[PDB]
């Protein structure tokens, strides 16, 4: 861990969809990608590992957390083998590729194993609100870096590894991603799961408004599988909400509505349901892993990840809007990566503080008497 300290003091190098696309379309030099990745991946792993070490002891202790750590170490060390191995050698490039595959596979069970970790911690030491926000901060960063590793590894294996599935795609990026098509696919997939259990499912209705070009299909440069992931979760929640609210009613099921809009900066996707909504008090906690499944916080990570966001608004008693914001421009869609440093360190070392704002008594004085 002298090597981990060092690489954890390096800053990550965030890439843009434009760069990924420009590279794979016009450049596409395996050397370049190797030189970049052999250094960047260890940077990213090391930034994360440094943060897992900052976790409360009772969480750091859990076997699941240990295994993750050791997997990351195992991966880090394997990638460091390449720091002095010349790209002017076919074999080095070939072996590097297999290394990437091996670490992708090793990291397959990573989301569930960590989750198992925090669940063990919760069920054994109990729910504290303050510490929950620490863990929250950690998981957002940890699951985002993991999304990022996977983005880099996929671009490299898809570009240089080969069953040629999506052919005009550049690695995992679609330069002409038809948003409504991903919307309909995500919907059908959630519909099937909803119908299977509930024996019924609401219909989807889709509208578009393309403000640049008012009647053209809305298209964006993007990773279709990220968009899909996000849409799938929101639709599953909308359907489940709608179906649960109307199963004991007489009026039949309101559709789940989608508005896709495109402006100078934003591609926005608003999903509306009449599933009864959620009180405002409970909204923030829906993003908090340890009240929770992880589906909604993780979907928001996919969104914040290329500079977008995922936001939820509800009217308790009627329904809920969920809105995905993506960047319209690939030149503006940079990776947003967590950076280990003193600011990060302070989040882990924060002890609780007095509230800033007042709090009433749990038993306020009776003002009638």
């Amino acid at each position: 861990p002298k090597q981990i300290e060092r690489y954890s003091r390096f800053s990550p190098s965030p890439l843009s969809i434009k760069q990924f696309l420009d590279f794979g379309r016009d450049n596409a030099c395996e050397k370049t990608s190797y030189m970049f990745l052999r250094k960047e991946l260890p940077v990213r792993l090391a930034n994360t590992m440094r943060e897992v070490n900052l976790l409360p002891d009772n969480l750091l202790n859990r076997p699941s957390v240990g295994l993750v750590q050791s997997w990351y170490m195992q991966s880090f060390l394997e990638l460091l083998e390449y720091e002095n191995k010349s790209p002017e050698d076919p074999q080095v490039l070939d072996n590097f590729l297999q290394v990437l595959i091996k670490v992708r596979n090793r990291h397959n069970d990573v989301v569930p194993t960590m989750a198992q970790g925090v669940i063990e911690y919760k069920e054994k030491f109990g729910f504290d609100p303050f510490i929950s926000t620490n863990i929250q901060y950690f998981l957002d960063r940890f699951y985002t870096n993991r999304i990022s590793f996977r983005m880099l590894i996929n671009q490299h294996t898809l570009l240089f590894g080969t069953n040629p599935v999506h052919p005009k795609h550049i690695g995992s990026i679609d330069p002409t991603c038809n948003v409504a098509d991903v919307v309909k696919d995500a919907y059908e997939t959630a519909k099937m799961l909803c119908e299977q259990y509930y024996l019924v499912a609401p219909e989807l209705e889709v509208e578009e408004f393309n403000a640049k070009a008012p009647d053209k299909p809305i298209q964006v440069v993007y990773v279709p599988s990220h968009l899909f992931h996000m849409l799938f979760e929101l639709f599953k929640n909308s359907m489940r909400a709608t179906v649960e609210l109307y199963e004991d009613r007489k009026e039949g099921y309101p559709a789940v509505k989608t508005l896709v809009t495109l402006g100078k900066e934003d591609l926005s996707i608003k999903i509306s349901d009449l599933g009864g909504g959620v009180p405002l008090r409970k909204i923030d906690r829906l993003f908090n892993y340890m009240y929770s499944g992880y589906g909604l916080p993780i979907s928001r990570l996919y969104a914040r990840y290329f500079q977008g966001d995922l936001k939820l608004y509800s009217m308790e008693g009627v329904g809920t809007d969920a809105v995905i914001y993506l960047k319209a421009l690939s030149s503006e869609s940079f990776e947003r990566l967590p950076v280990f440093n003193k600011s990060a360190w302070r989040h882990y070392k924060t002890t609780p503080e007095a509230d800033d704002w007042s709090n009433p008594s749990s038993e306020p004085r009776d003002a009638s008497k």
Binding site: T351, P352, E353, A354, D355, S358, N359, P360, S361, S362, E363, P364, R365
Partner: protein, 93 residues
């Protein structure tokens, strides 16, 4: 005798407060106290207040357990010590 120590008394935390409930300690025996850290939530009739640490040191002993209702003004709440070597001197009370 004992090593140099300070008693933390319950202040009037608002102008009309005459007693408070020690709802929760936010520090454990052995911990460093920096000036301004959160020490306890104190509940009155009027508010739930974050009582802050006023002088730096180390929490040596808690005189008033968590959950104790209706604690009068001036009641010692806990004991602070300058060095941590001096914490063990008070498990003895």
């Amino acid at each position: 005798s004992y090593p140099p120590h300070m008693q933390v008394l319950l202040p009037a935390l608002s102008p009309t407060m005459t007693m408070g409930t020690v709802q929760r300690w936010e520090k454990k025996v052995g911990e460093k106290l920096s000036e301004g850290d959160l020490l306890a939530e104190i509940e009155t009739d009027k508010a739930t207040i974050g009582f802050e640490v006023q002088e730096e040191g180390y929490l040596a002993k808690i005189l008033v357990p968590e959950g104790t209702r209706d604690v009068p003004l001036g009641t010692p709440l806990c004991i602070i010590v300058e060095k941590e070597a001096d914490i063990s001197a008070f498990a003895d009370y």
